[PDB]
């Protein structure tokens with residue numbers, strides 16, 4: 001179901017209706033320290049100049065990093081949400097795929113930090129995103 | 141132009157309705173060399189599975205608005221403008237209504253323009269901010 | 282005492298020995314939503330190419346933003362520390378002063394966010410820093 | 422050169438011992454086009470009043486090391502290199518001992534180089550990271 005971590009019986013929004021399902025994000029691997037995801041480039045991921053949208057690299061990074069955090073902390077009664085995302089853009093992507101790899105670099109009680117690499121089909125580093133993920137007690 | 145993006149060219153590689161921005165429904169309202177605003181109606185297409193506006197939607201709205209506000213000035217001078225850095229911080233979730241973005245230009249260098257983008261909900265509350273750095277380079281085209 | 286907020290009887294490090302006192306940071310105004318500080322440029326604030334050190338704009342922003350948060354939350358039993366600092370550098374400063382103005386934009390239970398402008402003697406915007414300040418219960 | 426900064430010029434505007442870097446005691450150890458390391462001994466001059474290493478010291482060490490690692494390559498090609506963006510996040514305080522920085526180059530464009538700098542304490546723990554973006558421009562000099 002994008003292969004997102006299956007941690008609850010019900011979710012407020014179905015995959016195919018989320019921004020994630022609309023653009024086509026799919027999680028490949030997930031462990032507590034490292035996760036990967038990818039997306040096919042289609043026009044839905046593009047801006048009007050024909051390049052993948054800045055927003056798309058950020059969105060990918062945000063979903064991957066946050067859900068990799070959810071995968072661990074949800075069963076502990078915690079919620080996780082993106083608190084900061086800093087994406088820098090080194091080379092455009094015009095077509096093909098964008099592949100993300102999220103590497104956990106700090107896991108604190110209140111904040112987890114992941115470095116996310118975004119690569120094209122040739123494996124070139126096209127963008128990076130520093131995701132900071134707030135972890136808080138789940139509200140009833 | 142679809143979504144009211146600056147009309148600086150006779151044709152574009154991708155039509156508004158097919159782009160990310162068209163799909164989620166970004167619309168530019170005001171646009172000047174120093175300030176631009178835009179908004180979007182929150183629908184599931186903007187949300188993630190937990191029912192909140194996706195962190196990506198805030199980045200994407202900031203990026204399009206800051207880059208395009210730059211394009212509006214520099215295109216006719218023979219330059220291209222692309223996002224080189226986006227730093228968004230998230231203060232409060234948005235569940236529904238609209239997200240409204242205001243981009244204020246704070247530095248316009250020869251190679252880099254910098255815009256601060258505030259993203260408010262329907263009550264006026266500041267829900268996210270984005271610092272956009274836009275690279276300006278001469279067109280290869 | 283740099284005019285930092287006077288919130289405790291004793292501090293681990295005296296002003297004149299801190300990095301702050303060494304380079305000469307002084308707070309001018311402080312309120313819960315807004316604070317200002319400045320520094321004279323001397324070689325101690327410079328790098329070897331003769332420009333004010335990138336580190337100096339960051340340090341100024343960090344001390345101003347954090348201590349403006351301390352000023353409010355300390356009496357509530359909370360500690361405040363910088364969690365993130367993103368500084369962008371628009372124009373160098375060679376001599377004169379650097380003047381900072383910190384404007385609080387979000388004050389949450391666990392995080393306060395301040396935007397800090399760094400200006401030269403002509404009033405030009407030479408750098409900005411986005412400070413994110415973690416606020417936590419003081420440890421005994 | 423003082424602090425072992427790259428020797429790329431016959432003279433410099435400010436001597437090592439008088440600079441910020443000289444004052445707090447930054448020392449570069451290794452230095453290659455793709456990776457550079459540096460360290461500093463924590464003393465009060467590096468701390469803020471609450472007794473922790475100042476957030477500014479971590480930025481300053483990252484900035485000097487990333488910029489100078491870039492200078493080392495580009496100076497002899499007629500370019501200058503200055504810090505254009507520094508994003509430091511703080512994971513754990515350092516009270517004493519040393520701070521050790523490792524800068525790894527992750528992108529080397531024609532106008533912008535990007536370095537990830539990790540800042541560890543004496544136990545090897547990751548206490549801060551800094552993302553440094555370095556602008557490369559032709560010298561006016």
Ligand SMILES: CC(C)(COP(=O)(O)OP(=O)(O)OC[C@H]1O[C@@H](n2cnc3c(N)ncnc32)[C@H](O)[C@@H]1OP(=O)(O)O)[C@@H](O)C(=O)NCCC(=O)NCCSCC(=O)c1ccc(O)cc1
Nearest residue numbers: 108109110111344347362363417469475476511512513514
């Ligand atoms: C930011 C934060 C508090 C967030 O915590 P987190 O990501 O959830 O990490 P966690 O809470 O798991 O704890 C990590 C470590 O932080 C420290 N810490 C965390 N919470 C607390 C607390 N409530 N009280 C004391 N220490 C704490 C403690 O060292 C902890 O290690 P441990 O003893 O728990 O093993 C923690 O990452 C941290 O302390 N980071 C370092 C902040 C820092 O050192 N910034 C620079 C110094 S303060 C900024 C500044 O430059 C300044 C300059 C001048 C001036 O006058 C005032 C300020």
Ligand SMILES: CC(C)(COP(=O)(O)OP(=O)(O)OC[C@H]1O[C@@H](n2cnc3c(N)ncnc32)[C@H](O)[C@@H]1OP(=O)(O)O)[C@@H](O)C(=O)NCCC(=O)NCCSCC(=O)c1ccc(O)cc1
Nearest residue numbers: 249250251252328335370371372373485488503504556558
């Ligand atoms: C980064 C950049 C060059 C980009 O330029 P931009 O955003 O397109 O703005 P623009 O190019 O329009 O010019 C803005 C000003 O920057 C300066 N500048 C721009 N290009 C050049 C150049 N090629 N040569 C000299 N100065 C230049 C110049 O002051 C210019 O003003 P003007 O004389 O042209 O009116 C400019 O924004 C800038 O200079 N920012 C300040 C960089 C800075 O001062 N960072 C801190 C110091 S260097 C980093 C550091 O901490 C360090 C520490 C220790 C150490 O050993 C080494 C380094």
Ligand SMILES: CC(C)(COP(=O)(O)OP(=O)(O)OC[C@H]1O[C@@H](n2cnc3c(N)ncnc32)[C@H](O)[C@@H]1OP(=O)(O)O)[C@@H](O)C(=O)NCCC(=O)NCCSCC(=O)c1ccc(O)cc1
Nearest residue numbers: 063066081082136188194195230231232233389390391392
């Ligand atoms: C980050 C943080 C939790 C930090 O809290 P803070 O700075 O101390 O602010 P504070 O705790 O005072 O609360 C501010 C508001 O946040 C919410 N909040 C804070 N803590 C909690 C909590 N424990 N439980 C539920 N809501 C909370 C709540 O709306 C609160 O308002 P109020 O009802 O308390 O008046 C809060 O600023 C926040 O919630 N920010 C927004 C985070 C956000 O919306 N990010 C984007 C969505 S999640 C990231 C994502 O894109 C994603 C995509 C796909 C996917 O599959 C999964 C994730």
Ligand SMILES: CC(C)(COP(=O)(O)OP(=O)(O)OC[C@H]1O[C@@H](n2cnc3c(N)ncnc32)[C@H](O)[C@@H]1OP(=O)(O)O)[C@@H](O)C(=O)NCCC(=O)NCCSCC(=O)c1ccc(O)cc1
Nearest residue numbers: 047054089090091092204207222223275277530531532533
């Ligand atoms: C920002 C910059 C131009 C700076 O260049 P740099 O770091 O010095 O790297 P360099 O200049 O060495 O070139 C790297 C690659 O960038 C591209 N590039 C650089 N300069 C140019 C140029 N003048 N014209 C076209 N492409 C260029 C080119 O692909 C180049 O590769 P190569 O063909 O030269 O091998 C380059 O890093 C880059 O292009 N980054 C990607 C920018 C990007 O793709 N951001 C996202 C898309 S635009 C922002 C956006 O989301 C948006 C959304 C909606 C909308 O309506 C408008 C915009």
